[PDB]
Design a protein around this motif. Structure first.
Motif, PDB file in Angstrom:
ATOM      1  N   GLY A  16      -4.302   5.434 -12.829  1.00 19.12           N
ATOM      2  CA  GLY A  16      -3.909   6.814 -13.070  1.00 19.12           C
ATOM      3  C   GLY A  16      -2.404   6.995 -13.114  1.00 19.12           C
ATOM      4  N   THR A  17      -1.965   8.245 -13.046  1.00 14.74           N
ATOM      5  CA  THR A  17      -0.553   8.554 -13.142  1.00 14.74           C
ATOM      6  C   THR A  17      -0.075   9.268 -11.896  1.00 14.74           C
ATOM      7  OG1 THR A  17      -1.008  10.652 -14.245  1.00 14.74           O
ATOM      8  CG2 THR A  17      -0.660   8.742 -15.616  1.00 14.74           C
ATOM      9  N   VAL A  23       0.466   3.943 -13.191  1.00 16.07           N
ATOM     10  CA  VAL A  23       0.339   2.911 -12.169  1.00 16.07           C
ATOM     11  C   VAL A  23      -0.879   2.064 -12.519  1.00 16.07           C
ATOM     12  CG1 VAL A  23       0.079   2.422  -9.707  1.00 16.07           C
ATOM     13  CG2 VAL A  23       1.319   4.465 -10.446  1.00 16.07           C
ATOM     14  N   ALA A  35      -0.378  -3.190  -6.787  1.00 13.71           N
ATOM     15  CA  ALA A  35      -0.215  -2.062  -7.688  1.00 13.71           C
ATOM     16  C   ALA A  35       1.144  -2.161  -8.334  1.00 13.71           C
ATOM     17  CB  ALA A  35      -0.350  -0.732  -6.937  1.00 13.71           C
ATOM     18  N   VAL A  65       2.017   0.988   3.228  1.00 10.05           N
ATOM     19  CA  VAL A  65       1.752   0.344   1.948  1.00 10.05           C
ATOM     20  C   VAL A  65       3.055  -0.328   1.503  1.00 10.05           C
ATOM     21  CG1 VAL A  65       0.987   0.661  -0.441  1.00 10.05           C
ATOM     22  CG2 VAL A  65      -0.007   2.021   1.398  1.00 10.05           C
ATOM     23  N   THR A  81       3.763  -2.974  -5.393  1.00 12.54           N
ATOM     24  CA  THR A  81       3.356  -2.642  -4.036  1.00 12.54           C
ATOM     25  C   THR A  81       2.026  -3.241  -3.638  1.00 12.54           C
ATOM     26  OG1 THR A  81       2.044  -0.621  -4.467  1.00 12.54           O
ATOM     27  CG2 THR A  81       4.444  -0.381  -4.399  1.00 12.54           C
ATOM     28  N   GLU A  82       1.742  -3.147  -2.344  1.00  6.48           N
ATOM     29  CA  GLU A  82       0.421  -3.408  -1.816  1.00  6.48           C
ATOM     30  C   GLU A  82      -0.632  -2.576  -2.557  1.00  6.48           C
ATOM     31  OE1 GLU A  82      -1.693  -3.470   2.619  1.00  6.48           O
ATOM     32  OE2 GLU A  82       0.445  -3.041   2.404  1.00  6.48           O
ATOM     33  N   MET A  84      -4.460  -0.778  -2.505  1.00  5.99           N
ATOM     34  CA  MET A  84      -5.375  -0.147  -1.560  1.00  5.99           C
ATOM     35  C   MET A  84      -6.631   0.280  -2.314  1.00  5.99           C
ATOM     36  SD  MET A  84      -3.635  -0.257   1.292  1.00  5.99           S
ATOM     37  CE  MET A  84      -4.131   1.103   2.338  1.00  5.99           C
ATOM     38  N   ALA A  85      -7.715  -0.469  -2.110  1.00  4.37           N
ATOM     39  CA  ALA A  85      -8.890  -0.342  -2.980  1.00  4.37           C
ATOM     40  C   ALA A  85      -9.607   1.003  -2.928  1.00  4.37           C
ATOM     41  CB  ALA A  85      -9.878  -1.458  -2.697  1.00  4.37           C
ATOM     42  N   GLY A  87      -8.158   3.990  -2.562  1.00  2.00           N
ATOM     43  CA  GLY A  87      -7.387   5.070  -3.133  1.00  2.00           C
ATOM     44  C   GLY A  87      -6.820   6.027  -2.112  1.00  2.00           C
ATOM     45  N   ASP A 128       7.869  13.056   2.224  1.00  2.00           N
ATOM     46  CA  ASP A 128       6.713  13.710   1.585  1.00  2.00           C
ATOM     47  C   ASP A 128       5.419  13.198   2.183  1.00  2.00           C
ATOM     48  OD1 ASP A 128       5.056  15.270  -0.076  1.00  2.00           O
ATOM     49  OD2 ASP A 128       6.026  14.629  -1.919  1.00  2.00           O
ATOM     50  N   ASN A 133      -0.495  11.264   0.025  1.00  2.00           N
ATOM     51  CA  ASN A 133       0.441  10.136   0.021  1.00  2.00           C
ATOM     52  C   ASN A 133       0.119   9.110   1.097  1.00  2.00           C
ATOM     53  OD1 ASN A 133       1.900  11.037  -2.224  1.00  2.00           O
ATOM     54  ND2 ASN A 133       3.071  12.473  -0.931  1.00  2.00           N
ATOM     55  N   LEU A 135      -3.013   6.046   1.644  1.00  2.00           N
ATOM     56  CA  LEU A 135      -4.024   5.313   0.896  1.00  2.00           C
ATOM     57  C   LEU A 135      -4.937   4.604   1.889  1.00  2.00           C
ATOM     58  CD1 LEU A 135      -1.605   3.796  -1.775  1.00  2.00           C
ATOM     59  CD2 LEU A 135      -3.425   5.372  -2.295  1.00  2.00           C
ATOM     60  N   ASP A 146       4.586   5.447  -0.446  1.00  2.00           N
ATOM     61  CA  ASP A 146       5.642   6.115  -1.209  1.00  2.00           C
ATOM     62  C   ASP A 146       6.698   6.790  -0.338  1.00  2.00           C
ATOM     63  OD1 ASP A 146       4.720   5.150  -3.717  1.00  2.00           O
ATOM     64  OD2 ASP A 146       3.133   6.645  -3.689  1.00  2.00           O
ATOM     65  N   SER A 150      10.800  10.174  -2.639  1.00  2.00           N
ATOM     66  CA  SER A 150      11.034  11.544  -3.084  1.00  2.00           C
ATOM     67  C   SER A 150      12.499  11.779  -3.442  1.00  2.00           C
ATOM     68  CB  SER A 150      10.593  12.532  -2.014  1.00  2.00           C
ATOM     69  OG  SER A 150      11.480  12.482  -0.920  1.00  2.00           O
ATOM     70  N   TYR A 158       9.678  19.848  -8.639  1.00  2.00           N
ATOM     71  CA  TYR A 158       9.415  19.149  -7.383  1.00  2.00           C
ATOM     72  C   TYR A 158      10.588  19.221  -6.406  1.00  2.00           C
ATOM     73  CZ  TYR A 158       8.526  15.255  -4.146  1.00  2.00           C
ATOM     74  OH  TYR A 158       8.359  14.469  -3.030  1.00  2.00           O
TER      75      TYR A 158
HETATM   76  C1  LIG Z   1      -0.813   1.382  -4.182  1.00  2.00           C
HETATM   77  N1  LIG Z   1      -1.687   2.296  -4.930  1.00  2.00           N
HETATM   78  C2  LIG Z   1      -1.164   3.323  -5.648  1.00  2.00           C
HETATM   79  C3  LIG Z   1      -1.938   4.226  -6.336  1.00  2.00           C
HETATM   80  C4  LIG Z   1      -1.302   5.315  -7.140  1.00  2.00           C
HETATM   81  C5  LIG Z   1      -1.748   5.520  -8.453  1.00  2.00           C
HETATM   82  C6  LIG Z   1      -1.180   6.498  -9.255  1.00  2.00           C
HETATM   83  N2  LIG Z   1      -0.203   7.259  -8.802  1.00  2.00           N
HETATM   84  C7  LIG Z   1       0.260   7.090  -7.586  1.00  2.00           C
HETATM   85  N3  LIG Z   1       1.300   7.886  -7.100  1.00  2.00           N
HETATM   86  N4  LIG Z   1       0.909   9.100  -6.546  1.00  2.00           N
HETATM   87  C8  LIG Z   1       1.767   9.910  -6.030  1.00  2.00           C
HETATM   88  C9  LIG Z   1       3.171   9.544  -5.969  1.00  2.00           C
HETATM   89  C10 LIG Z   1       4.084  10.376  -5.310  1.00  2.00           C
HETATM   90  C11 LIG Z   1       5.415  10.034  -5.217  1.00  2.00           C
HETATM   91  C12 LIG Z   1       6.356  10.974  -4.501  1.00  2.00           C
HETATM   92  C13 LIG Z   1       7.793  10.476  -4.623  1.00  2.00           C
HETATM   93  C14 LIG Z   1       5.954  11.030  -3.022  1.00  2.00           C
HETATM   94  C15 LIG Z   1       6.270  12.390  -5.085  1.00  2.00           C
HETATM   95  C16 LIG Z   1       5.861   8.847  -5.788  1.00  2.00           C
HETATM   96  C17 LIG Z   1       4.961   8.010  -6.432  1.00  2.00           C
HETATM   97  F1  LIG Z   1       5.418   6.854  -6.952  1.00  2.00           F
HETATM   98  C18 LIG Z   1       3.610   8.349  -6.566  1.00  2.00           C
HETATM   99  C19 LIG Z   1       2.590   7.491  -7.182  1.00  2.00           C
HETATM  100  O1  LIG Z   1       2.892   6.408  -7.700  1.00  2.00           O
HETATM  101  C20 LIG Z   1      -0.251   6.135  -6.707  1.00  2.00           C
HETATM  102  C21 LIG Z   1       0.273   6.063  -5.292  1.00  2.00           C
HETATM  103  O2  LIG Z   1       1.417   5.242  -5.130  1.00  2.00           O
HETATM  104  C22 LIG Z   1      -3.340   4.039  -6.291  1.00  2.00           C
HETATM  105  C23 LIG Z   1      -3.862   2.982  -5.567  1.00  2.00           C
HETATM  106  N5  LIG Z   1      -5.234   2.687  -5.421  1.00  2.00           N
HETATM  107  C24 LIG Z   1      -6.282   3.167  -6.183  1.00  2.00           C
HETATM  108  C25 LIG Z   1      -7.546   2.634  -5.944  1.00  2.00           C
HETATM  109  C26 LIG Z   1      -8.599   3.109  -6.694  1.00  2.00           C
HETATM  110  N6  LIG Z   1      -8.374   4.036  -7.621  1.00  2.00           N
HETATM  111  C27 LIG Z   1      -7.166   4.515  -7.823  1.00  2.00           C
HETATM  112  N7  LIG Z   1      -6.132   4.098  -7.116  1.00  2.00           N
HETATM  113  C28 LIG Z   1      -3.006   2.096  -4.877  1.00  2.00           C
HETATM  114  O3  LIG Z   1      -3.474   1.156  -4.237  1.00  2.00           O
END
Ligand SMILES: Cn1cc(-c2ccnc(-n3ncc4cc(C(C)(C)C)cc(F)c4c3=O)c2CO)cc(Nc2ccncn2)c1=O
Length: 265
Positions: A16-17, A23, A35, A65, A81-82, A84-85, A87, A128, A133, A135, A146, A150, A158
């Motif tokens: 996702g995003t 990501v 990730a 993480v 990054t690490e 996390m299955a 989410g 934040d 935030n 996992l 994360d 911020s 934001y």
């Molecule tokens: C490490 N990681 C990251 C994510 C994941 C995916 C998409 N967006 C994000 N996000 N979400 C929120 C986010 C927020 C920030 C702030 C600076 C605090 C505003 C900065 C980020 F960089 C992110 C980001 O990258 C993440 C969070 O970093 C999902 C994981 N896992 C899963 C597992 C199953 N399905 C989906 N995701 C996982 O293991």
């Protein structure tokens, strides 16, 4: 800073995003789950981040993480990054809401509190902290994600305290009024996070707008005790919400409080 060779990364799945764009889940050297954030051009203050990134990478704790490394010799840059299955914690709470015992909820708070005690000991601010935030891994361990990022966000909705993406519902009065961040503002957010956990992922101050939330918490409104929180647990989260920052506990104190409740039960 660990500069990872992008040739060592194999992309496998879309995750996702987020605030910096796409990501992906993948493997490093065909073995390690990671990730990979592909940093969207214009979304991040990249020179600032690169200049300051090593501090973030040196943060190492089981309940964080981990930021392993970066790929900066190309466009877009990557953050690795690490993985996390399970989410994000907010979705995990909502999807399994009928399966939790209260002891598991307290364990989630302990996990996060350990991570934050470590950050506090390194004088490092999350900025934040919220269930969205955190996992969850394949064994149900909650970790904080994360932290510190911020600061590098380029998005006026934001970064403005009156922007529609600003984390008003997790912010103490001194952040809303003065943009004064400190470990005590992370403390306030942690209390809200505890409330999110014990309410099984409800939105704090739901039905209030951001400005109504700000107005009313400045005047003393506080989140009610969730049905699943004992009085002892509520006392802990409520202590995070003292109007005056200097009256709030440290994460070291909160961790001790949480462990005490666990021992009694
Ligand atoms: C490490 N990681 C990251 C994510 C994941 C995916 C998409 N967006 C994000 N996000 N979400 C929120 C986010 C927020 C920030 C702030 C600076 C605090 C505003 C900065 C980020 F960089 C992110 C980001 O990258 C993440 C969070 O970093 C999902 C994981 N896992 C899963 C597992 C199953 N399905 C989906 N995701 C996982 O293991």
């Amino acid at each position: 800073s660990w500069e990872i060779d992008p040739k060592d990364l194999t992309f496998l799945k879309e995750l996702g995003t987020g605030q910096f764009g796409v990501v992906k889940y993948g493997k490093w050297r065909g073995q390690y789950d990671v990730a990979i954030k592909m940093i969207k051009e214009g979304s991040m203050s990249e020179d600032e981040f690169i200049e300051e990134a090593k501090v973030m990478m040196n943060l190492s704790h089981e309940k964080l993480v981990q930021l392993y490394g970066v790929c900066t010799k190309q466009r877009p840059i990557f953050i690795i990054t690490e993985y996390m299955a399970n989410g994000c914690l907010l979705n995990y709470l909502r999807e399994m809401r009928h399966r939790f015992q209260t002891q598991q909820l307290l364990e989630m708070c302990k996990d996060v509190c350990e991570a934050m005690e470590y950050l506090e000991s390194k004088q490092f601010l999350h900025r934040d902290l919220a269930a969205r935030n955190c996992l969850v891994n394949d064994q149900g361990v909650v970790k904080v994600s994360d932290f510190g990022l911020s600061r590098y966000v380029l998005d006026d909705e934001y970064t403005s305290s009156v922007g529609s993406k600003f984390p008003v519902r997790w912010s103490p009065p001194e952040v809303l009024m003065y943009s004064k961040f400190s470990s005590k503002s992370d403390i306030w957010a942690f209390g809200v996070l505890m409330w999110e956990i014990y309410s099984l992922g409800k939105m704090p101050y739901e039905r209030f707008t951001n400005s109504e939330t700000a107005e009313h918490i400045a005047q003393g409104l506080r989140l009610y005790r969730p049905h699943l929180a004992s009085e002892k647990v509520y006392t802990i989260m409520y202590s995070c919400w003292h109007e005056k920052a200097d009256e709030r506990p440290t994460f070291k104190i909160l961790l001790s409080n949480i462990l005490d409740v666990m021992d009694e039960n």
